[PDB]
From a paper:
After screening many crystals, several were found that contained the peptide matching residues 10–27. This peptide formed an alpha-helical structure, and bound to a region on the surface of Chs6 roughly opposite where Chs5 binds. The Chs3 peptide makes direct contact with several residues on the surface of Chs6. Chs3 residue D19 appears to participate in a hydrogen bonding network with Chs6 residues D731 and R713. Chs3 residue E20 appears to hydrogen bond with the main chain carbonyl oxygen of Chs6 residue G31. Both of these Chs3 residues, D19 and E20, are part of the conserved DEESLL sequence that was previously found to be important for interaction with AP-1 and that we found to be important for endocytosis of Chs3. Interestingly, the conformation of this motif when bound to Chs6 is alpha-helical, in contrast to the conformation (D/E)XXXLL motifs adopt when bound to AP-1 and AP-2. In those interactions, the (D/E)XXXLL motif is in an extended conformation.
One of the many transmembrane proteins that follow this route of transport in yeast is the chitin synthase enzyme Chs3. The transport of Chs3 to the cell surface requires the exomer complex, which acts as a cargo adaptor for Chs3 and other cargos. Exomer consists of the core protein Chs5, and four paralagous adaptor proteins called Chs5-Arf1-binding Proteins (ChAPs): Chs6, Bud7, Bch1, and Bch2. We also present a crystal structure of a portion of the Chs3 N-terminus bound to the exomer complex.
Residue numbers in the entry:
A (entry chain P), F (entry chain P): 2 to 15
B (entry chain B), E (entry chain B): 31 to 399, 413 to 554, 582 to 743
C (entry chain A), D (entry chain A): 4 to 12, 18 to 48, 50 to 77
Write the structure that this text describes.
């Protein structure tokens, strides 16, 4: 899923 | 999403310090000249990015560079985007000038031009086509030559990625197959390779699997098969595209039809289609035959192709147990190509299956017989030696161009003269990145078939059974050629034992040689090694010993013992070599087992995550093989349950899930067409 | 064809004494000075047996693994 | 003898795939890549016909111009 | 008797003045070295006698010499006797020293040794064997090498005497066949040649009649046949001697048997014996055949011999009209020797006689393809130019060594640098010696086939028909090879005319070349020339013109016209060339005439006496041919009537009768055994 | 005849 992908990247930033 | 991932990959590239400024570009140019004046350029050199810096105190220019694949050179746009990211994300000290020159080099082996895109500090770029044989020559770039640079980069990226022995340490492999629309990006690549099929003989070939490049045996055909293997939903599309090409370009029909057969090969659904196309391709062709006293250099080109298509037929018939029909095809194939290893190989297989061992051994007897890179890398050897070949000034300059890195952290990640830094940590797991991958290092090149040359010298010396090493060194290595012959011999001893094999050898002598005798003795020693039971009254054995023993057990078809030994070699430390062998077994099982599952999906998924993490540490973000394995796991588990099992892994986190979910999303996109 | 070339030997000779010169030493050790040969050699009729054999085997494969 | 050597061509090949290499370019222009020949050639039986013919003619001369 | 004659011959030798002292011996030695290092010595050089004189006023040494054959070198006795006569009969002036060195040189071509017998003024002699290749070498003489010098001198004397083109001007030819007992002397010579038969391939051969030396074609076999031809009463003796040799030396049986066949050839009495021996020689030999894959250099030696014996058989069968049997033999002969001219020649003859002209012409098409001497002689050219190349000092020295000669008589007999003096006048007739022989001079060497190069240039220019000359020059000369082919062509035009011959040539083309075309055109021109009627309304034509026309008429088989033209060429002046042709016609008539006598014995005897006289003038006292002709005349006339007719000749006298009665006595001695 | 030969030579001397 591309949603899961975006969620990981949004969380990588912390 | 994919753009986020790509930019992160672009920001996480390593750095090699040039000894003397510009040696990197001069060595490349000289390498290309040698390739051209040797007759076989092949794929040419891997792409490089060169960075030109000015130290200001000292008025020294100095350079950094690294190797990269997977940037699509459709035109200049994507390399320029890459260079723009590199420069906009730079972190340099006051002593380093802001005036930096960035250069991207992509070799075009269709025209033997090295295409170089220069990017300056004023954000201007220029493209230059260099002919290295005509030396002073620089050309103007047409759309036709942009397209063959494109095809060059894609072919080279696929071939390099699927062959670790061709990889230099620190190689950055980009996921060329991702884009805004996955299906469209994949179609564009497939159509590109298909349109260049008439020129596939100019794409080079692997000389270790075939004597001459053929329509079947060349890098373009290999790269197309490797890419289709991870896009199974696009097979029908590709066959349709190839049929369209025949309509418009019938003069090259043999190439398009050979690609069709190659694509459909080893796909159970499409066996009827493959056989049908094989039929309508082979029994004209049989007719360019006879009318011909002129003997022309295209006749050998087509006899080769006809022979290779018959081999595909022969292999099909053997796998379905149709031994009589296979022998009729194989006999015909051997006549058209007495120079073909594969024709004699399949003939021997026909005789073995028919239990005509003498005739098989005659066929084996009547059978025909590294890019100077890598000075810059020094192996850690499991933390036993220091791996640092930089001068103080070279380190000062390196640090000056990597200002955001604290300097002792930077020095710990230098392996010889290359800074193995991975900033964005895509694919990171603590277990792998902060431990085992720091030891060992990148596992690539000719030594990567096992870990003998990667561990401590003491661990090698602590192995008491010398034969374990002697039968696993890198020169002795079976080679693809004699590995195949070894397999035939093993197939024979499986039926009548080694002593039976010797009796056939004298039967053959009655109607003698040396290199085959070498294989016989090697085979014998491997068989003795294969029946070593390696414990209790409780000794201890290193992981390396279990690995080496596992490799030998694979070689002698002791599958249960092999998987068991390879798994125990991973219990100690993670073992990339053992891991890859296990993944390979799961992907393509041995045929002679009774439909046995040697490795359950939970075991495989555990190994696959570690392997993906390891590959990411040293910049393999392409990972065609692991995509293949993920696809197989998706097939038998479904994507939901698969992702559950991945989330269960104890080492899992955001950094590794970025990589995995990107892979899963790409795969999910493909299941729509 | 169907000749008969008597030797002196590399030089061969017909009954009507036409002299063809063949094989300086490529000629066998099973031929002598003043020995008679029987040249011809190159049968290009048996090229269609194996064309038939080839087409037949291809037909059997198509029948068994291709059609209904 | 009586063989049949299929060609790839100079290299010839038997049915059992034994490979004899003959005539780099001494082989005819009436032979092709993947053509079949029919070697043998060197009949050393017809050496006594002409020995008989020779002895017979010598006998006729002796009879007519030598004896009574 | 014979000793009186021999001493008179020894006292009548000419003198050549050496330009610079010793050039004669140094040129001889150098000639021999060239012969040896060229591979074929052949018979080597003719014998010489060298005379070393001292002028005393001037302290100059100077030399005189002359060429000689026919001295038997059994050992040193006979050459020494010759030298003793030379010195004891010298007539020298006061200025010439009495200390003279005399040297006799005889070359031995069996060992390549030049044997030199030196005779000093103290009447001592010494013999020296010189090897010219090993330069400084001088040897000791064994009886074995004395015997091969003997055989060398005899072979060379016979071959030289029967071939005028090999004769230098002024050559002294001694009658080697005379002795105290004629029969014994002849037997000794025959036995000598017979015992050397195994070595006949080392005696050289005539390359104009055969490509390689064979057991049949070599100088030893030729010399034996030529000598037996004037000793017909010794044939049975010789056959018996040869049979004895086979008993004692059976390993060389093929040589002895080949000699037997050669001797008996062309003798009607012994045709049954020849055929019988041919039979028992040919049908083993047929059997060294077959057993032989080794191919050895003796196999070509024997295939050649077998082929030559078949040719003898073929020629026998053709002459008896047995064309079918001849063709069977001739076909076999051509297979065993495709290199043999004679095998193809006889094959063509077989086809011609069978009126298969096309096949004959194919056989002709399929058919295989001077001792720097004589500076010292200048031709008189019929008294039109002066022939004197001596310096005043050279003449003074010559006169000083010939004191009994009055000096203007001496100068008139000098022809260039050789004094053609003949003191004892054996064979003298006024008509010949004091007139015609003074003009013309010796008729020998390659120019002796006609008189074009011997008469005045004006007489040549006065011939208006250029073709008469063009078809009679010395380079154009038919040669023995193409003379034979010419004969075949003539044999064909005799049956179907020249236009018929042309039609066969295109028939042959239908199943083209140049040298045979040359013969065709030559043949045509000769045929046109042959039908010239050369008189009345009374012109005048020189003797040379009649001669040349006669030679062409012989060539085209116009026998009646030829004899008529040749005879009229003698009416003017005596014509040695015309004479020899007429004598030859009488000795061996053309076969195609109806047993016609072209020349009666009275005409022949008249010519023969003049010819004998002419030959004697310039030192031919051997005259094998004229002996042959005398023997034939004796046969059909008886010796009494023959001698009557000789005494009737108007030019006859004591000097010519000494020669003739010596010849007749020798012949009479032979008719006893 | 050898007698004829001797007679010629005896006469040659005059």
């Amino acid at each position: 899923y591309y949603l899961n992908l975006n969620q990981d990247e949004e969380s990588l930033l912390r | 999403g994919y753009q986020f991932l790509n930019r992160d990959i672009f920001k996480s590239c390593p750095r090699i310090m040039e000894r003397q400024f510009g040696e990197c570009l001069h060595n490349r140019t000289h390498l290309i000249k040698d390739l051209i004046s040797s007759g076989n350029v092949g794929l040419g050199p891997i792409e490089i990015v060169h960075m030109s810096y000015l130290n200001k105190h000292e008025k020294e220019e100095f350079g950094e560079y690294f190797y990269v694949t997977g940037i699509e050179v459709s035109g200049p746009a994507m390399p320029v985007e890459f260079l723009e990211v590199l420069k906009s994300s730079k972190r340099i000290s006051k002593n380093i000038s802001n005036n930096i020159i960035l250069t991207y080099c992509c070799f075009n082996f269709f025209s033997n031009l090295d295409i170089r895109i220069r990017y300056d500090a004023d954000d201007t770029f220029q493209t230059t086509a260099i002919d290295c044989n005509k030396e002073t020559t620089d050309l103007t770039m047409t759309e036709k030559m942009w397209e063959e640079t494109f095809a060059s980069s894609v072919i080279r990226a696929i071939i390099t990625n699927t062959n670790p022995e061709l990889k230099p340490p620190g190689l950055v492999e980009c996921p060329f197959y991702v884009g805004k629309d996955t299906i469209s990006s994949c179609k564009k690549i497939i159509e590109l390779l298909c349109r260049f099929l008439p020129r596939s003989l100019n794409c080079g070939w692997d000389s270790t699997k075939s004597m001459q490049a053929t329509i079947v045996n060349n890098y373009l055909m290999y790269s197309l098969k490797s890419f289709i293997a991870i896009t199974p939903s696009l097979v029908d599309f590709t066959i349709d595209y190839l049929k369209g090409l025949t309509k418009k370009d019938p003069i090259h029909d043999i190439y398009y039809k050979t690609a069709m057969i190659t694509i459909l090969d080893h796909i159970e659904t499409k066996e009827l289609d493959m056989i049908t196309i094989l039929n309508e391709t082979l029994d004209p062709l049989l007719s360019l035959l006879n009318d011909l006293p002129p003997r022309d250099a295209d006749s050998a080109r087509l006899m080769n192709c006809m022979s290779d298509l018959l081999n595909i037929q022969t292999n099909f018939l053997l796998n379905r147990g149709d031994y009589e029909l296979a022998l009729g095809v194989s006999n015909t194939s051997t006549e058209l190509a007495l120079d073909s290893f594969e024709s004699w190989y399949n003939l021997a297989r026909c005789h073995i299956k028919k239990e005509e061992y003498e005739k098989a051994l005659f066929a084996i007897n009547s059978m025909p017989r590294r890019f100077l890179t890598s000075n810059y890398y020094k192996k850690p050897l499991n933390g036993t030696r220091e791996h640092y070949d930089l001068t103080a000034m070279e380190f000062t300059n390196l640090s000056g161009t990597l200002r955001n890195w604290k300097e002792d952290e930077l020095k710990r990640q230098i392996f010889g003269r290359i800074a193995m830094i991975n900033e964005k940590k895509i694919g990171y797991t603590k277990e792998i990145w902060d431990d085992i991958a720091i030891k060992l290092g990148p596992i690539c090149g000719p030594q990567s078939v096992n870990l003998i040359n990667y561990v401590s010298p003491q661990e090698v010396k602590n192995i008491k059974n010398i034969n374990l090493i002697a039968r696993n060194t890198i020169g002795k290595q079976l080679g693809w050629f004699s590995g195949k012959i070894y397999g035939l011999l093993m197939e024979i001893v499986n039926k009548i034992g080694w002593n039976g094999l010797l009796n056939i050898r004298t039967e053959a002598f009655m109607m003698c040689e040396g290199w085959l005798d070498d294989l016989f003795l090697d085979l014998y020693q491997d068989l003795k090694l294969s029946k070593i039971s390696l414990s209790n009254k409780d000794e201890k054995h290193s992981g390396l010993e279990w690995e080496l023993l596992g490799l030998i057990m694979l070689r002698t078809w002791h599958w249960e013992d092999a998987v068991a030994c390879l798994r125990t070699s991973i219990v100690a430390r993670f073992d990339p070599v053992s891991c890859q062998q296990l993944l390979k077994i799961y992907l393509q099982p041995p045929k002679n087992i009774q439909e046995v599952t040697l490795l359950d999906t939970d075991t495989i998924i555990s190994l696959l995550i570690k392997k993906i993490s390891y590959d990411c540490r040293y910049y393999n973000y392409c990972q065609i093989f692991n995509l293949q394995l993920l696809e197989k796991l998706c097939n038998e588990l479904g994507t939901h349950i698969l992702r559950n099992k991945i989330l269960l892994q104890p080492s899992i986190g955001d950094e590794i899930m970025v990589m995995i979910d990107a892979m899963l999303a790409w795969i999910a996109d493909l299941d729509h067409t | 064809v169907d000749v008969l070339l008597t030797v002196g030997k590399a030089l061969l000779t017909t009954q009507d004494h036409h002299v063809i010169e063949f094989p300086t030493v490529l000629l066998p050790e099973n031929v002598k000075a003043g020995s008679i040969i029987k040249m011809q050699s190159q049968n290009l009729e048996e090229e269609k047996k194996q064309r038939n054999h080839f087409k037949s085997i291809q037909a059997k494969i198509l029948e068994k693994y291709g059609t209904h």
